[PDB]
Design a protein around this motif. Sequence first.
Motif, PDB file in Angstrom:
ATOM      1  N   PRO A   1       0.782  -1.206   0.000  1.00 21.45           N
ATOM      2  CA  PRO A   1       0.000   0.000   0.000  1.00 21.45           C
ATOM      3  C   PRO A   1       0.817   1.260   0.000  1.00 21.45           C
ATOM      4  CG  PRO A   1      -0.163  -1.043   2.178  1.00 21.45           C
ATOM      5  CD  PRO A   1       0.715  -1.972   1.255  1.00 21.45           C
ATOM      6  N   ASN A   2       0.316   2.343  -0.575  1.00 20.86           N
ATOM      7  CA  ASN A   2       0.982   3.642  -0.548  1.00 20.86           C
ATOM      8  C   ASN A   2      -0.071   4.480   0.250  1.00 20.86           C
ATOM      9  OD1 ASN A   2       1.065   6.561  -1.385  1.00 20.86           O
ATOM     10  ND2 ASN A   2       2.901   5.769  -2.058  1.00 20.86           N
TER      11      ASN A   2
ATOM     12  N   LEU B   1       4.516   4.970   5.742  1.00 14.31           N
ATOM     13  CA  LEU B   1       3.780   5.198   6.935  1.00 14.31           C
ATOM     14  C   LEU B   1       4.527   4.645   8.207  1.00 14.31           C
ATOM     15  CD1 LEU B   1       1.088   5.920   8.382  1.00 14.31           C
ATOM     16  CD2 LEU B   1       0.267   3.724   7.813  1.00 14.31           C
ATOM     17  N   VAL B   2       4.616   5.454   9.229  1.00 17.88           N
ATOM     18  CA  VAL B   2       5.240   5.111  10.437  1.00 17.88           C
ATOM     19  C   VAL B   2       4.108   5.293  11.437  1.00 17.88           C
ATOM     20  CG1 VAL B   2       7.035   5.690  12.056  1.00 17.88           C
ATOM     21  CG2 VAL B   2       7.386   6.210   9.816  1.00 17.88           C
TER      22      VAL B   2
ATOM     23  N   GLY C   1       5.582   0.674  13.782  1.00 17.74           N
ATOM     24  CA  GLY C   1       5.299  -0.210  12.654  1.00 17.74           C
ATOM     25  C   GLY C   1       5.682   0.642  11.421  1.00 17.74           C
ATOM     26  N   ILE C   2       6.446   0.111  10.487  1.00 18.96           N
ATOM     27  CA  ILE C   2       6.863   0.871   9.332  1.00 18.96           C
ATOM     28  C   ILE C   2       6.435   0.138   8.134  1.00 18.96           C
ATOM     29  CG2 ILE C   2       8.938   2.011   8.081  1.00 18.96           C
ATOM     30  CD1 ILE C   2       9.442   0.561  11.620  1.00 18.96           C
ATOM     31  N   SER C   3       5.728   0.779   7.195  1.00 22.86           N
ATOM     32  CA  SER C   3       5.201   0.029   6.010  1.00 22.86           C
ATOM     33  C   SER C   3       6.245  -0.236   4.910  1.00 22.86           C
ATOM     34  CB  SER C   3       3.965   0.736   5.381  1.00 22.86           C
ATOM     35  OG  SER C   3       4.273   2.047   4.765  1.00 22.86           O
ATOM     36  N   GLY C   4       6.918   0.824   4.550  1.00 24.37           N
ATOM     37  CA  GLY C   4       7.872   0.720   3.455  1.00 24.37           C
ATOM     38  C   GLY C   4       7.133   0.581   2.110  1.00 24.37           C
ATOM     39  N   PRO C   5       7.899   0.158   1.081  1.00 20.55           N
ATOM     40  CA  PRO C   5       7.283   0.028  -0.268  1.00 20.55           C
ATOM     41  C   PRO C   5       6.560  -1.217  -0.518  1.00 20.55           C
ATOM     42  CG  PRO C   5       9.671  -0.024  -0.563  1.00 20.55           C
ATOM     43  CD  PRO C   5       9.383   0.072   1.004  1.00 20.55           C
TER      44      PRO C   5
ATOM     45  N   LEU D   1       3.787  10.216   8.116  1.00 16.59           N
ATOM     46  CA  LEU D   1       4.305   9.852   6.827  1.00 16.59           C
ATOM     47  C   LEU D   1       5.688  10.382   6.647  1.00 16.59           C
ATOM     48  CD1 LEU D   1       2.478   8.400   4.711  1.00 16.59           C
ATOM     49  CD2 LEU D   1       2.378  10.644   3.673  1.00 16.59           C
ATOM     50  N   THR D   2       6.617   9.615   6.170  1.00 13.10           N
ATOM     51  CA  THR D   2       8.012  10.183   6.114  1.00 13.10           C
ATOM     52  C   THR D   2       8.067  11.263   5.026  1.00 13.10           C
ATOM     53  OG1 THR D   2       8.815   8.403   4.648  1.00 13.10           O
ATOM     54  CG2 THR D   2       9.431   8.196   6.954  1.00 13.10           C
ATOM     55  N   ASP D   3       9.068  12.116   4.974  1.00 19.35           N
ATOM     56  CA  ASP D   3       9.071  13.053   3.904  1.00 19.35           C
ATOM     57  C   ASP D   3       9.798  12.624   2.629  1.00 19.35           C
ATOM     58  OD1 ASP D   3      11.695  13.695   4.529  1.00 19.35           O
ATOM     59  OD2 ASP D   3      11.126  15.461   5.838  1.00 19.35           O
TER      60      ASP D   3
END
Lengths: 200, 200, 200, 200, 238, 238, 238
Positions: free
Chosen positions: G49-50, G96-97, G164-168, G130-132
Motif C-alpha cells: 500500500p501507498n 507510513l510510520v 510499525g513501518i510500512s515501506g514500499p 508519513l516520512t518526507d
Amino acid sequence: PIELLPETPSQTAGPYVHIGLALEAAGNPTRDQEIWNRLAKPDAPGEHILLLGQVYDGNGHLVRDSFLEVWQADANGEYQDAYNLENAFNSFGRTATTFDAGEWTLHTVKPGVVNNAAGVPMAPHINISLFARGINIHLHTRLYFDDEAQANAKCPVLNLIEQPQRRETLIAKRCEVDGKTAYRFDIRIQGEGETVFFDF
Amino acid sequence: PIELLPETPSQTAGPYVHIGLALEAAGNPTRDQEIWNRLAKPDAPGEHILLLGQVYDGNGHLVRDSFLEVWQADANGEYQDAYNLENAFNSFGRTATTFDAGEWTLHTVKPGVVNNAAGVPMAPHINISLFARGINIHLHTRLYFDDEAQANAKCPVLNLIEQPQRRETLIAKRCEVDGKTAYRFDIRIQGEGETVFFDF
Amino acid sequence: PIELLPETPSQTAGPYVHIGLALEAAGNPTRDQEIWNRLAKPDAPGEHILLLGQVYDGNGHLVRDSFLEVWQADANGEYQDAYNLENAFNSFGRTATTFDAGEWTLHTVKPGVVNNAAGVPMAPHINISLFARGINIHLHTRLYFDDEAQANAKCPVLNLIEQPQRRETLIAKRCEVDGKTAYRFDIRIQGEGETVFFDF
Amino acid sequence: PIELLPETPSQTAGPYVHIGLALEAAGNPTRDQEIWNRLAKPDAPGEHILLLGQVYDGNGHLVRDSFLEVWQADANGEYQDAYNLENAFNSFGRTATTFDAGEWTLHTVKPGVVNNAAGVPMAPHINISLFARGINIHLHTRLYFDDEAQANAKCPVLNLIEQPQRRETLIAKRCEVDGKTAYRFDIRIQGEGETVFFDF
Amino acid sequence: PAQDNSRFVIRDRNWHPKALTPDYKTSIARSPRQALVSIPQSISETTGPNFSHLGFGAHDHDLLLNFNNGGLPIGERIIVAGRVVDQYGKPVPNTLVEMWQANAGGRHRHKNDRYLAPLDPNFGGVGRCLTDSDGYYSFRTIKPGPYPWRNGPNDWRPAHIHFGISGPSIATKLITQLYFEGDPLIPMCPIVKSIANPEAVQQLIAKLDMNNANPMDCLAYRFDIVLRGQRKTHFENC
Amino acid sequence: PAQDNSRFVIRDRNWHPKALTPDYKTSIARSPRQALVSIPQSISETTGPNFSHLGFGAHDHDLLLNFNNGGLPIGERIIVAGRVVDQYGKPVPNTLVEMWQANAGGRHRHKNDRYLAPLDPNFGGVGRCLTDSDGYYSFRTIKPGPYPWRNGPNDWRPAHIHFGISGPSIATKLITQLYFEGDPLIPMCPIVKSIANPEAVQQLIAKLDMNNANPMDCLAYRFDIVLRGQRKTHFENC
Amino acid sequence: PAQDNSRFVIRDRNWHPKALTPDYKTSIARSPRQALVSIPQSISETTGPNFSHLGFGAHDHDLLLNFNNGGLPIGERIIVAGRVVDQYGKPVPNTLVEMWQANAGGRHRHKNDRYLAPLDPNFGGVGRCLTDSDGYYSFRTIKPGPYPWRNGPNDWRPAHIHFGISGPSIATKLITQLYFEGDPLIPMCPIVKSIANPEAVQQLIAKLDMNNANPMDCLAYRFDIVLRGQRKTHFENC
Ligand SMILES: [Fe+3]
Ligand SMILES: [Fe+3]
Ligand SMILES: [Fe+3]
Ligand SMILES: [Fe+3]
C-alpha cells in the motif's frame, strides 16, 4: 563478501498492539481516518465475500490478541496500491481477534488471477501477515479458496510445498452467513495441523 | 587429558546420494560390479527371507530419498567380511527407497546367533545404518524378528533399552509378500513410535 | 595451500670449488678414485668425440674457475646410472676450465636418441650444469650437435624456445682436432649471444 | 597530505587481448559494429596517409601480439570525440600486429596542428598507446612526421626531450606502399634506439 | 569370518554435527527427539566388510574418462588425493572410498535435479577407489560448481564433492563432504554451519596442492580423512 | 570537437605495477630501460573518444547468450557488476567497458591457446557495455577456470576476467584484470605479484555479492573500478 | 495498479529474533515448529500500500496534543525523529510510520492493562506519520516508563515505544520497538534478549540528540530505521 547496512530487527507487537493499530478493538476513540476490515465498499465489482477465522496456539487455545494485515488483488487481478478511503476497493486492510471477538472478519471481494515472475498464473489468494504477542517476527501466509480446486492444483506457489497435506492448511472452506458467501480460514500456529508459513 | 586426532566430521548424504551409491536407482547406467540388495543367492544356506520397510519422518510422511546399509551374520552365525559378488552370501548390502519405490526391499537369509563381548548370545538381528538428506550423521539401528520371542526376551542389547514399549520398535513383523516369507520393518525417525537408535 | 619442508638454499661453489671437486685441476694429489672428464674408455660403442668450449662472462672475459657436470645417454639412447670406473661408458662426468686450461674438454660418445614424457623423441643432447664463483645457483643447459639438423628441427625441447636465434646458442659447431671428431660449445652467460638456460 | 581513492591498478593485456579488442584478428566472428583501423573514409577531408610499423623487444625480435590505440586530431586540427562508424573521420582507432601480420597498419589523414595549454602549437602528431603481454601498464608515445621538420623543430613537446637523438625515435619516415603515401613508425621497446615513452 | 579383537574410540557427538540444526530445514522432521541408546561394542559393530575383491573397472577413479561420450568434460581439471588414517595416525589400507558430485556448473546427473545449468554430455559424476597399502587414494575429476537449493530463499551450496568411507568396521563408516579452500560460500552454508566448532569445519576443506599438480595439465587438492581410532581390547571380562 | 577544460590526477607509478618485474618473464625484454619523459597535459591527452553512438547489439553484455549455438554455456553462472568512479568518487557515465575471458575450464577461444581443456561450443568469451548515468555496468557470464602457462615450470593463472575501460580521456584509459574473492592462486601468481603493495592487489578482487544474485539461478560478484580523478583547471598561464 | 519491477534483499533470520526464544514465555506456544517455506518474490510480495492519500489529522504525530482533555501530559517531553533508509542507504519517502507506547508511568490506555500506575487523562499513546521526500519522520511525545509483566516473577520491560513501518511493500513491512540510550533494563529483558547478536540490539537504541532538542522545552532522541534493500530486477527469464 559484499555487506549492506543491516535491516532494523523485528520485535513482537505485544498485547497492546491494538492501541496503535485497531483503535476501535482496543475500545478507544478513533480518528477521522482508519485502515480497517472493509476492503470493498458494497458497490465494488466482483464477487463479494466475508472472511473469517480463528487463530490457535500450539496448545489449541485461542489467540485473542492477534492482528492481521492483508493484501490482495481486486476482481480483475490488479493490485490497487493508492490507499484511499473513498475508493470502492482497496487492496490492503487490517483486522484483529479480540477478548470479545475470538474471531476475526473481513469484508472484501474474491481476488482475481495474477501471474508470477515467470508469467505463470497463481491461483486466487490473499496474502496474510500475522502479528501478536509471543510472535517475534510476523508470519506470512496465503489464503486460498476451496471452490478454486483447479487453479489451486496448478499454482506455482502451492506446488512449492512438498507435502500435499500441508497444502491443505492454506485452503479456506466455503460457508454462508446470513445469506452472504463466507470463507472460514483458521490459522494453527503450531502443532497438529500447523498452517504453512512462507519466507520471501 | 590425552587428545587423539579428531574424527573427520559427518555431513548429510544429501538428495543425490544415489548418484554415487545406488547407481540403478538415480536412474543411471551401472558398472559391471555394484554393492546392492541381494545378500544371498538362491543356493545359499539358511532360511531365505525378504525384508521391506518404509521410512517415516516426524510428520508421518515418507522419506523417499533414504539409503540403507546393512550388516549381518549368515545362518550359522558368522560375519562374512570378504565381499565378493560370486560368494553365495555377503554379510553386507545396500538398499534404498525411491520416488517410484516408497519402500526398500532386501533379499537375504535370517541370520544366526552371535555372542556379545561378555559371551552372552544376542537374538537374531540385522544391523542397520541409515542415511538421507536432513540426516547429518547417520543413524544406527537393529532389526529383530517377531517370531524369535524367546531369544528377544533374553538379548543383552534389547534389555539395555529401559522402557519395554521402546523395545518393540525394533521388532520386524512376519508377513507374506508374493507368498514368500517376509518381515516388515518400518522406521519412524521422529515422533510417536520413534524407532530406538543406537550409539556405540 | 599444502606446504612441504623447504629445499636447502643454493650457494656459489666459489673459487676453490676445484679442491673438493677437480683435485688434479687445483694441483693437489688425487685419490685412487676420481669422477672426471673421460666418459668413454676408448673401446666403448658409438661414435667417439671430443667436446670442448670456453665460458664467457657478460663483459666477454673468460671465466677460468668454472666447473661442469654432464649427463648423457650412451650410444643407444640409454642412461647408465651405476657409476663405475671400470665401465667402458659412464653417463656422468665432470670437467673444469683452469688459469692454465682457459678451455674445458671432455672425451665421450655422441648420445643416442631419447624420448620425452609424451613418447616424442628429443634430438641427441648432453645436459650440462654450470657452477662457478659468482653463480648463486647452477645453470642448466643442453648441448646439441650441428650435424643433427633434422632431429634438431623436430625436438620438443629445442621447440619450447620462442625465438629461432636463441636455439642456435645450444648448438655445438663440428670441428676436428688431431684427426679426432670434436665439437666446440661455448657458453655465454650474459649478454650478446647469451646461451639459453633452462628451468625444470 | 590529502589522499584520493587510489586508481585501480593496471594489469598486462595478455596474449589473448585480441579476443576482446581486435575480434577479426583473434580469427573470431565479428559483431555488426567494431572499433578498428580506418579512421578516415575515402571522402574525408585532408591528406590521406597509410601508417605502418613493427614492434621490437629488447632482443631485436618482433612483438607479434601487440595492440595499439591511437588518438588524433583531424585535418583542421580538431579532436572528433563523438565516435561513430558513419562519420567520415573518427579521431580514434585501433590496430594490432598478428603472427600472420608482424606489422600493424592504420588508414587515416595527416593530422592538423593543435595548441598546448600555454597557447604554443605542437607539430602534427598521432597519440599512441601500446599494449601487449609482458607490458604491465601500457606505453605512451607520439608519432611525428619527417616532412614536418620545421614544425618539429619548434614543438614544445619534442623540445622536452633533453637529448636530440632521442627526439629522432619519435619521427615516422615518409615512404611508399603500393604507391600511396605512407609513414613508417617502428617501435623499439627497449634497447638501442629505444623509443621515447611518455608520462602525463 | 571376522573376529572381535578390536574396539573403536567413542564418537564425539559434539564434534560432529547434531541431528537437529534448524537452519538446515529438512533436519527438523528428520531427527530423533528421543536419546540415542548407548550399547557396548560387540562383533556386530566392530567388524565390517572388506572390499579387496570387488571388481573395479580401469577408470573407476577417473571421472575425466568413466562416463565419456567421445570427449572431455568441461571445467577445472583436478586431481583430489589424500590419505585415510585412524585417530591414532595409523594408515587405513584397502579401504573403500566413494565419491559423487555435480558438474562444472552445479548440475547433478539425477532426475531430481531441475536446475537450469546444463548436463555435460561427457560427465557422470561418480567415482570409487580402494586406498593403497599406505592409506592413499586418488581421483581425477573437474571442480564442481556451487548450486542453489530450496532451503532459504537465496541459499547456495559451496562447491563440494561427497565422500563415503568404509574403513575397518561398520562402527567406522562415514559419509562426508569435501569443500574447497577459500570459497566464500563456505561460512554461509547452513549445512556447513550444522558443525558447531570452526576447527571441525576446517577439517573438511581440501587444500590446494601445487606439489601434486601436473604442470600444464591439472591442479591438485589434498583431502586427508581421519576415521575412529582402532585399539586392541585389554583387561576385558577381566 | 572536444575542449581542454580538464586535468587528471598524476598516476602513482608505485601503486601500479612497474615495467620490469622479472618473475613475470616476458616483461624482461618488454620494458623500457630509459625513463618515461614527463609532459604537461594538453588537449591531446585530456580528450578521448565518447562511445555513446556506438551500435551495441542486444546481448553484448550477455556472454550466456552472445555466442550461442543452440545452447547454454557450461560453468558457474554469474553476473559481474559494479560501478566506475574517478578518484574523487564521481561517477563516470556512458563509459566503454570491455571484457574477455577463458571458458569454465580455462581454455580461450583463440588460435594460440593450445591447452588440453576443451572449447565450449556455446561460449565466446567477449563482452561490452556502456556504463549508465550513474556509472553502473553489468554483465552476465560463467566463472572462468584457472589455466597453466609457460612462465615458470608449474605456474597457473588464477581465474580472472580481463577488463578494458576508456573513461573520459585517453589519459584515463586502463586495462586490468579482475580476480575472484578467496582463490588460493591469487598470492602465487607472478603477474599479480607484479603489483608491489598488497592493498593494490586487493582492489582487483571482485567480491561475492549475495544481494545482487538471482535466487535459484545465478550468483553475483561486485567489481568497482576507480579511474584518475578529473578536476577543472585553475590559475593556468596565470 | 502496481507493477513488479522490484526485488528485495532476502531477510537475515539469524539477525532478527528466532520464533522460539524460551525466556520469553509466550513465544513457546506461539511459534511454528515446521520450517518456513521459501518462495520466490512475485508481484504479490513486491508491491504494497501507498498511504500518500490517507488523511492525517493536524496532530497525529503529536502525542502532547492529540488526546487532550485540556491539559498537557505529565512526563519528560521529548521529540523522537529519524530517518527511514533501505539497506542500500536510499531514503524511503512517503512511508507510513505508526507508534504506540504507555504513559510516564508505565500504564497503557487499554482494558487489559490492570497495572497500578494511573492513567494520565491528557495522554492517549498513539501517533502516525508519513516520512518526507527525504525519509524523515518525527513525533512529539512523553518518555514512557518501564512496567512489569507476568513473564518471570520480577520482569520489567525497559521504556520503549512500538513502531510499525510500512515501506514500499509488504516484504518490507516491519514491527519493532525503539529503546532509550543507557536504560539499565535493556540488557536484562528477555524480549530484547531474543535478538541474539548484540549489534543487532544496538540498532534499537535511540540516542539522545541534543542538536535536535528545543532549549527550555524538550529533549530529543534520534532513531533511524533500515528497511530491506530494494534493487531493479536484472537477467530474469534471461
Ligand atoms: Fe510494550
Ligand atoms: Fe550435494
Ligand atoms: Fe669458501
Ligand atoms: Fe588471461
